[PDB]
Design a protein around this ligand. Structure first.
Ligand SMILES: CCCCCCCCCCCC[N+](C)(C)C
Ligand SMILES: CCCCCCCCCCCC[N+](C)(C)C
Lengths: 160, 160
């Protein structure tokens, strides 16, 4: 637990729909520095299942192509926290969302930390306010790389 | 002129000596995203000539090696601004320095902008205060990539 910022009162049904990865940050440069860096994932769509799990549609540059990936994040007893299947089993946390304009989330390793966060917005627009929130959520965290994307890039697959 | 932050009262004789590129930022992701990205330059030493020009010793990852480069920055009528030889002739500006602990500077293209800034410190240490200054100098600028380095990396050639 490096991330001690979770959304109280979260209803994942309302995070449904389209999102744009406006900004990203990570604890290690190599997590985000290249198109094919392991945590450079661009969120396309959130699908909350009836059960309350969270499917995630994303783009990730893998073999020189911009590939479509589907990720299932399984709900926990904490409504703001979800779990993905991997060797280390990675944790997704929702820090803050207004549902209508922005959503802030981080992904973190159970063990070693290793951490990346994103500022998601609904439309291809530089939302100053939400970036402020993201920045303020960042100061508490040991980030060493930050990226942010313009409205042109936001409309391209893998933000090209 | 995107950068409208210059040091008043600057004496480049006192910027003499050792510096560490603690943090960097740029207007375009591709300027800083890889070891061999064009503006990923790590400052090693500043040498102000008697005339008042500014030689710069740096490291830059070029052909898989971490190479030593010497850059001469020629003084202008503005004491805070210097000029480097290139096709576009690049401008170096000193935004703020206490001489003893931190120095903030940017490099910018005369035409298109294209811009990178660094927070330099004297020792291999995460200076929170100077990073605050760097952050505050950044909010005015359209940066899309930011990096920062830990004390271990600061002691390695090309911050490895
Ligand atoms: C609520 C928002 C959820 C979005 C989370 C997307 C998870 C990115 C997957 C990276 C981890 C997988 N890995 C290690 C194999 C590359
Ligand atoms: C006061 C501090 C001064 C440090 C400035 C160092 C200049 C970096 C050189 C990059 C431009 C050269 N280029 C385009 C060929 C890669």
């Amino acid at each position: 637990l490096i991330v001690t910022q979770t959304m109280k009162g979260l209803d994942i049904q309302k995070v449904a729909g389209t999102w744009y990865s406006l900004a990203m940050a990570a604890s290690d440069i190599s997590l985000l520095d290249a198109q094919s860096a392991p945590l450079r994932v661009y969120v396309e769509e959130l699908k909350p299942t009836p059960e309350g799990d969270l499917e995630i549609l994303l783009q990730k540059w893998e073999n020189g192509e911009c590939a479509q990936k589907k990720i299932i994040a399984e709900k926990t007893k904490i409504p703001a926290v979800f779990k993905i299947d991997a060797l280390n089993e990675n944790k997704v946390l929702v820090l803050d969302t207004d549902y209508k304009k922005y959503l802030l989330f981080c992904m973190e390793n159970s063990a070693e930390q290793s951490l990346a966060c994103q500022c998601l917005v609904r439309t291809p627009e530089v939302d100053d306010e939400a970036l402020e929130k993201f920045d303020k959520a960042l100061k508490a965290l040991p980030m060493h790389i930050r990226l942010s994307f313009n409205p042109t890039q936001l409309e391209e697959q893998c933000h090209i």
